[PDB]
Amino acid sequence: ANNLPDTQSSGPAHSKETPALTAVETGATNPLVPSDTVQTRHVIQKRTRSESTVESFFARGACVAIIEVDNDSKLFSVWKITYKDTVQLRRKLEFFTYSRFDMEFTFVVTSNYTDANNGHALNQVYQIMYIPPGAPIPGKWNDYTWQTSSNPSVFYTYGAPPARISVPYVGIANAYSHFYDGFAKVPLAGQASTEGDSLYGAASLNDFGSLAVRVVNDHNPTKLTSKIRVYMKPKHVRVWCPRPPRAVPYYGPGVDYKDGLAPLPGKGLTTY
Amino acid sequence: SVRVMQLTLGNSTITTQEAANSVVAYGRWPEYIKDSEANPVDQPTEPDVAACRFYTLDTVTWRKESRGWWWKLPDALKDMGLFGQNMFYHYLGRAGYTVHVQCNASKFHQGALGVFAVPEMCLAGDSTTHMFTKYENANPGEKGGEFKGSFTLDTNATNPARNFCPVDYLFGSGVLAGNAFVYPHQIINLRTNNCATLVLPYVNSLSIDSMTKHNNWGIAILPLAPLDFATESSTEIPITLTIAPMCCEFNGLRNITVPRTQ
Ligand SMILES: COc1ccc(OCc2ccc(COc3c(Cl)cccc3Cl)cc2)c(Cl)c1
């Protein structure tokens, strides 16, 4: 996040040192600066790379999900936690193979009457319950699971500033894997083809669990719908192994492609 | 004294025996770009004596009916010797100036000319289409332009003139001319002086810019008190304009620029 070096003045040359010539076969990039190939003046550099630090690049709340609940089973909804339901944050994360950070979740809740001239309801309160992989998932908008004696819940009152909570680095590995070239199972010799088969590039069937959202108020016959837009921001970021960015449209959770396979336009070789 | 001076730049010298001091705009003398304010990294060219010398642009004539004249810098000097060459061969260019306006008459003549140096002197156009003045009209070169006594809207839709319509009392830009004194200036009152001398530093929001796309200064000359003589309804006295670029430095050399004309 710092300063750039100054440009030193450089005069003419006539020597056996040729920085302009190189050999990219080695796998290295030629570290030339302007003064290597032209005469330069002294410039005191004041520009910095403060905004391109790994932290500043991700320091934005991106939408990862839009959970919908109809307060007239739709009285409650469950969202399997992921960053792949949307494309924008996903593409930025995928510039790297591994990552490690904390997360900040902000929830923007909106609601409205479906009918322009019918129904009425008192102010709604929402419960956003996190169900860690293993915990019982709600079957009804009002069954015993909503007691949350151990699961973390967030109760949001409609109209209040967006709710917000922080989550630590929760991975079971030392870093989050954006790419996993493997399987969760190894098919063994002799077992039925139905056996030992698993998805390519998938780890746990339930990585991070899911969110169960519901309106706590008793539902009125009035037609109402609410949407909880989930925004996530990685804070305290560290990333490893850069990768080229996604060039063609995403086709699922994997690196699969199908449709926009011809991303580049035509342009004449000798056309400026 | 305040009245006698001699200016020498390169191979050119100007003498005056009736000056009224000289003005150094904003109290800043022209200078070269410092390393702490430098932007383009390539080695600059500094023609020095070949470009920083006095160039005499065309002489205009003042009559009882004149409304005023205007020029744009570096535009007015684009065809001036090696200064113009360097201007067109380089992407970027920077320069300050010494503007010396000349106008002598006699002890029986009257009149006062207001000479103003305006940074970013944007002028008003002639159509209902905003910012419609075309490049060729905005950059007249050494001949410059003239102020008008009234606004006249160009209505030829088939062939719009796309020119300026600078009304004099509106300073050609929608402001009152009497307030133009907030800009560096001098007055050539015939009963007092022969000339006006202004030293202009480079003014811009950048250290260096494109001289072909952008005019930094504008020179406006307005008759504050009209020309009058003895009893000759007929009177004409010339106004000669001599300008010298200062501290010229150019960056970004390539093939020469040949702008479209007329
Ligand atoms: C590589 O990029 C990643 C890695 C992991 C991720 O998710 C891990 C994750 C694990 C638990 C929770 C649970 O967080 C919550 C809690 Cl406790 C209470 C209330 C609401 C929430 Cl929301 C949320 C996200 C995401 Cl979205 C991107």
From Swiss-Prot, chain A:
Biased composition (Polar residues): 1-12
Chain positions covered by the region annotation Disordered: 1-19, 27-46
Subunit field text: Interacts with capsid protein VP0, and capsid protein VP3 to form heterotrimeric protomers. Interacts with human PVR. Five protomers subsequently associate to form pentamers which serve as building blocks for the capsid. Interacts with capsid protein VP2, capsid protein VP3 and capsid protein VP4 following cleavage of capsid protein VP0.
Residues of the full protein shown: 602 to 879 of 2207
Organism expressing this protein natively: Poliovirus type 2 (strain Lansing)
Protein localization: Virion; Host cytoplasm
Name listed for the protein in its UniProt record: Capsid protein VP1
Entry function: Forms an icosahedral capsid of pseudo T=3 symmetry with capsid proteins VP2 and VP3. The capsid is 300 Angstroms in diameter, composed of 60 copies of each capsid protein and enclosing the viral positive strand RNA genome. Capsid protein VP1 mainly forms the vertices of the capsid. Capsid protein VP1 interacts with host cell receptor PVR to provide virion attachment to target host cells.
